[PDB]
Amino acid sequence: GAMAPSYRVKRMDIAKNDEECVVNAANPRGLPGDGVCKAVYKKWPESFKNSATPVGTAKTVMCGTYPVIHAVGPNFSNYTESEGDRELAAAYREVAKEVTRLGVNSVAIPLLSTGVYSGGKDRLTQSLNHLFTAMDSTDADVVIYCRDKEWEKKISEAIQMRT
């Protein structure tokens, strides 16, 4: 655990993170995918051996000794708002279990279901709040990675609001 567990946000490629492990915004089939998933595939391709896992779950695969936590959020194109919300909350609880099990002091995490799985909706607040709900009881330093300057500001504001 970190001495004073924190949340931070950075606007950069999660493939360049400075944390002890990474959460992939994975697809259920362990495919290279698009966006964060493709960057993770390019950086840690070894971590996609038997990484396939159901929606609402997380499966960790080691790239050397570096843990890649494959977290499968729902594709809101396919799920109802209600069932999608439940699966998105569940994927983050599974991430918290994995981070805890690994005993890491830090984790790099993207906002699940906010890109091509968003179903064309802004889900920053929905995804971030599920991340907080899962990770608040962990003592890892959490570093949220995003690519948009306005999302960076909104995530930074949400973190600071609670401090």
Residue ranges for the binding site for ADP-D-ribose? 13, 27, 35, 115-117
Give the span between the Cα atoms of 98 and 115, in whole angstroms.
Answer: 23
Residue 73 is given by DSSP the state -
What does the chain come to in residues?
163
Pairwise CA distance, residues 97 & 86, whole Å: 17
CB closer to Cl ion out of 135 and 151: 151
Nearer to Cl ion by Cβ, of 106 and 113: the residue is: 113
Nearer to Cl ion, 67 or 74 (CB): 74
Q: C-beta of 80: minimal distance to Cl ion in Å?
A: 17
CB of 3 to Cl ion, least distance (A): 28
Binding site for Cl ion (CB under 5 A): 12-13, 25, 115, 117, 146-148, 151
Phi, psi of 127 (to 5 degrees): -70, -45
